[PDB]
């Protein structure tokens, strides 16, 4: 059930001998709509080929989580450099909310409502990979029974 999302795509400029050269770069995520997402970055000549190089990175590793009520099992924190992400679980099917640099990473994994926020610097690659670090921060079940609840 493979699904892909483009988050951002732009051109870049670079210095060479006595001048400059232009190229394309993309930021993407890929997931299964039910438990996993992977993140990709990529640069190339021609824009579709840059996007495709990012999709191949998003397939190089995926993070697999146990989503609960189409939302988070518990609150989570994710960090990459200056970009800090925090997420509170959402109630009543509503609460979405959050910009594409958080939302796109979760709408590809099967999340329907989530109260995500980003803090610090807003480079979207760092925010997306901090959202992925927050998905490495979530735990699985509802099995260990060590707390009364809830």
């Amino acid at each position: 059930e493979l699904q892909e999302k483009l988050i951002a795509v732009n051109r870049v400029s670079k210095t060479v001998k006595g001048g400059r050269i232009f190229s394309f770069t993309a930021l993407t995520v890929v997931g299964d709509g039910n438990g996993r997402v992977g993140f990709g970055y990529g640069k190339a000549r021609e824009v579709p080929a840059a996007i495709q190089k990012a999709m191949e990175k998003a397939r190089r590793n995926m993070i697999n989580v146990a989503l609960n009520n189409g939302t988070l099992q518990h609150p989570v924190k994710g960090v990459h450099t200056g970009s800090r992400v925090f997420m509170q679980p959402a109630s009543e099917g509503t609460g979405i909310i959050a910009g594409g640099a958080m939302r796109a990473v979760l709408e590809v994994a099967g999340v329907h409502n989530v109260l995500a926020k980003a803090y610090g610097s807003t480079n979207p690659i760092n925010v997306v990979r901090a959202t992925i670090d927050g998905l490495e921060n979530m735990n699985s079940p509802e099995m260990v029974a060590a707390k009364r609840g809830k």
Binding site: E92, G93, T94, I96, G99
Partner: protein
């Protein structure tokens, strides 16, 4: 406010049917959809993300003819009681009198239904109506006045309503030309192409 271009220009720019300038031809003729696309879209643009966004926002507006200040008010009313703006927004457009008078078949378009209310040809709960931007509720009864039942445009609109899928939100009888609202509409029971993916994220980033 009005639209002064040919009403099919909108559908020909969209490559999609918007239920505009309708009558006893019903569908496709001479709508020229993807046969006369004009000067743009053939060749469909990529453009900015701000495209869908705006051109997708206009497609969910112009299908109900609603003005931006109305659309922002319905987004406020759809953001009530945690009902979701991707869902409870449809009830504020589909439940509006210029859509109800159209769904009942008194007008062939939402414009023609709106016109019939501005011409005082319609009643709601036994009283005449002149405001078409008004919400209808269950047990409200809507009907055409005897002084207007013989207009050829209504005659055609009722023959077109028989060529259209019947709604599960309201009833109408062709012999009395009277109909009653029954239940407020639902996404998986409206079962048609209207947006969700943008009406969940308006007026914010």
């Amino acid at each position: 406010a009005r639209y002064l271009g040919p009403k099919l220009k909108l559908s020909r720019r969209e490559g999609t049917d918007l239920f505009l300038k309708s009558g006893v031809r019903a569908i496709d003729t001479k709508c020229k959809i993807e046969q006369a696309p004009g000067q743009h879209g053939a060749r469909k643009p990529r453009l900015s993300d701000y495209g869908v966004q705006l051109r997708e926002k206009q497609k969910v507006r112009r299908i109900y003819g609603v003005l931006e200040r109305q659309f922002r008010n319905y987004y406020k009313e759809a953001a009530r009681l945690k009902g979701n703006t991707g869902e409870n927004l449809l009830a504020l457009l589909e439940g509006r009198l210029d859509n109800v008078v159209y769904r009942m078949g008194f007008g062939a378009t939402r414009a023609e239904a709106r016109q019939l209310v501005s011409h005082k040809a319609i009643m709601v709960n036994g009283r005449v109506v002149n405001i078409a931007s008004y919400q209808v509720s269950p047990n409200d009864v809507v009907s055409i006045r005897e002084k207007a039942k013989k207009q050829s445009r209504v005659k055609a609109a009722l023959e077109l309503a028989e060529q259209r899928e019947k709604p599960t939100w309201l009833e109408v009888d062709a012999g009395k030309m009277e109909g009653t609202f029954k239940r407020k509409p639902e996404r998986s029971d409206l079962s048609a192409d209207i947006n969700e993916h943008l009406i969940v994220e308006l007026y914010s980033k």
